[model samples]
Target: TTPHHISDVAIELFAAHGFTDVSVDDIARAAGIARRTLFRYYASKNAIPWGDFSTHLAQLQGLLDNIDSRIQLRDALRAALLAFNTFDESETIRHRKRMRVILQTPELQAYSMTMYAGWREVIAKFVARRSGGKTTDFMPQTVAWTMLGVALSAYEHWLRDESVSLTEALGAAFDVVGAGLDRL
Candidate 1:
């Protein structure tokens, strides 16, 4: 509950004043809590908003679980992108700014990469489950890496040229892999 309040406050502050300008005290005060109380919720200043991975993993799992297995990867991918696209323009801008700041911060980058590794294992399990274990049984690591590559490239394109629709970006990404047995 304290972390939730801190996230609410930090997100509002970060969105309004830029991430670099916000301090721990600012977050604590904004959340109507003392600095020590803020520390009890988050170990450090960076973990204020996205401290726990369980919630995000659950949300992503829910998305994947509800997706129609009959749909091809491209279609399913588009559906996932559209799910993210539910965010409005202002939110997207704020998100991009947050991502930019995160990229420049080494501690945040390390923490994020560790979190991403755990997330990849979960996503790989989903892929293996969905693919019926024939081709995707033992290659979860590689498969997850490829999926991250595709998604990261798509995100980079989106970051650069907002003109491209999410589906188009995703389609263009998978197009690079082509229809090949080796790639799969």
Candidate 2:
């Protein structure tokens, strides 16, 4: 309970105050906990030290795990996206705004970039699974990297247009290499 409280407070304070302006004590003060208690949950205030995204990631893998062999790669991917649509639009925008703010700050930008890079590795494994026995070759990894590019492009486009829907932005991004997908 304390950890969750601190985590939520940290996000709000970080949003209001720049990353540097906020401290462990500041978060603890906002959360009604001792700084020592706050440190127990997160080692350092890394913007997003904890969350349900890991659970969601595991659920994502589970969804992929259930994919029927008859489903082609393209349709499987669309199915995966549809499944992820469980994440609410407001939640996505809230996360993106926090990320955008953190990314603009020099200290946190490197961490954000590094964290995003790690996502590619996770997605690569999923891609490998979907590629089936063909994953023995590098094609699965290639597919993973391509999807990563599409996601980044979508995020960029979303950041640019306040009026654009995330789904539309993502769809437009996939459209670039969609023909490759269509051929499948």
Candidate 3:
């Protein structure tokens, strides 16, 4: 009955039916809505499993937008990414289930490139602005790439270990990113 209303029901249907077998109209029927209205909520079937992401992504960029410029670069990133991932505890279980579907489905994996690029762009622009560099510059680009990896790896950790908080995993992973990982 929240932002997850359609996504939760649809993901369960997909898990049981297999991702390829479930059509967007099928989800619409399952959720008791027409296909047009369902499309109002999600752009495509592949995007259905993601929780209200476009809104959240904008919120993430906004979080970065407000950080005090005096904070160190990596620390600013740590704050923004952690804030981005923090979700209501009520949605946690459903969130994990969605991750399982999105991460495991091959079709979704390719589609995820489209999604991840936006996240990287947000980080890239933030790092670029704070560091007095251009968004496409080597330093900001590298940090954006590495930060995306760290954030995804943190999601994997949180997904695998139910007892751990997502923010904890994310915060720890950001620390590792800030530290020189070149040391064996």
Candidate 4:
């Protein structure tokens, strides 16, 4: 709970200011924690914005594990992503800020790439398991990359227009991909 408090407060500060404008000292002061404590919570100031991404990744991975194997790969993957991305309506503003910072901020974007890789790996592993193929196989990697692209596109669209439902946008994007890959 303390870590969550620090991170939430840090995010508020980051969103209010700019990601690059804030320092570890600034976060610690705003969060009312010692500078050393802040470092203990996050490897560096750059890590504050991510906020337990691995937990969420594990959540999606668990969802994938339990999904009906009989379901088509596309349908199952889409459903898993919908679950992965859904946020509370009350937190919409904060969620938007967090995502915008991660996606749009030039400094944070590179850091986010490593986190995105984890998401892609989860998808690739799920595909490999379901298809009885190696995770290194081309098909699994391609499917994982494609899903990430679709999700990111939907996220960008969702951020651009507040009225747009992210889940629906992702669904539509997946539909477009599905239609285009009729041979698959």
Candidate 5:
């Protein structure tokens, strides 16, 4: 089976059985593949829910890299987020399942920090470049942190309410921040 096939079955199993309770053997068995073959696609069961996220990161990097110089830094970064999460309509349920599995599972939640750092760094770098500062600078890192908060909060909201569109929820989350800051 393909990586996508393995991940789909694995996510369904984890969602039903819990991440920690499910084993590599179980995933392999469910996918009709050997443990070794499964390992070829995923480094560990912890990595299963993430499924080719590095490709998405690459897209994010390109999005940030090619952002129009004329756009405001905040708007540019926000545009990057729009592009970052543009999933097809058919993938919503699967994406929601993956997000639920990752966010609800404590172990996966802890592990997600390292995984999420790549996206943060991308945002930080873009912020720094636009602001003529280093990524390690306070403003860039702070913006990255703030944007990450916006994203995670939106994700939590989206997961809790199936009726809302993910993109609109994200846009509204960002809008709240902009509106709040506009008052200052």
Candidate 6:
């Protein structure tokens, strides 16, 4: 089966059973593949929820890299983030399931930090390039962390609030960020 097929089956299995209860063998069996073949697609069961996220990170990198220079930094970031999260109508349920599995599962939640750092680093790199600062420097890192906080908060809200779309939730969160201390 394809990576997407395996991940689709795995996510459904994880959501129906528990993340801890679902094993690689279970996922492989559900996907009609060998355990070793499953490993070829995912490094571990914990990585399944993310599903090619490093590639997604690269996509995010390109989005940030190609951003219009004329916009203000935070504005550029907000627009880029909205674009990054924008998904097709057909994909809404699956995307929500994947995010929910990661956010709600204890194991995946911890593993998420490891993946999240790469996403933040992309933002950090963008900030550094635009501001003539190093990525490890205070300003860029701070912005990256702040943006990450903003993003996760948006996702949490979107997960719980059926009324709002993910993109709108993200937009609202970034609007608050763009408003600075006045929002507090």
How many residue pairs clash in each candidate at the backbone level? 0, 0, 0, 0, 0, 0
TM-score of 1: 0.71
With candidate 1 superimposed using the best TM-score fit, by how many Å does residue 49's alpha carbon deviate from the native? 5.0
Candidate 6 TM-score versus the reference = 0.94
True lDDT of residue 16, candidate 2? 79
How would you order the candidates by lDDT, starting with the best? 6, 5, 4, 3, 1, 2
Off by over 4 Å in 2: 2-5, 47-50, 85-93, 132-137, 180-184
Clashes in predicted model 4: 0
Go through the candidates in order and give each one's C-alpha lDDT: 0.67, 0.67, 0.83, 0.85, 0.85, 0.87
Q: On lDDT, who's better, 3 or 5?
A: 5
Ranking by TM-score: 6, 4, 5, 3, 2, 1
What is candidate 5's local distance difference test score? Answer: 0.85
User: In model 6, what lDDT does residue 49 have?
Assistant: 79
Cα lDDT, model 3, residue 157: 93
Which scores higher on TM-score, 5 or 6? 6
Residue pairs in collision within model 1 = none
Q: Which candidate ranks first by TM-score, i.e. highest?
A: 6
| Local accuracy of candidate 3 as per-residue lDDT tens digits, 63-174 | 8888888888877888788776778976776778788898889989877887888888888889877878688898888988999889889999987888999999998888
Model 3: residues >4 Å from true position, as ranges?
Answer: 1-4
Cα RMSDs, all models: 4.2, 3.5, 2.0, 2.0, 1.7, 1.3
Off by over 4 Å in 5: 182-184
Q: Each prediction's TM-score against the native?
A: 0.71, 0.77, 0.90, 0.93, 0.92, 0.94
Clash pairs for candidate 4: none
Higher lDDT: candidate 1 or 5? 5
Stronger candidate by lDDT (4 vs 6)? 6
lDDT of 5 at 52: 84
User: In model 4, which runs have C-alpha deviations exceeding 4 angstroms?
Assistant: 181-184
Worst 10-residue lDDT window for candidate 6 reads 174-183
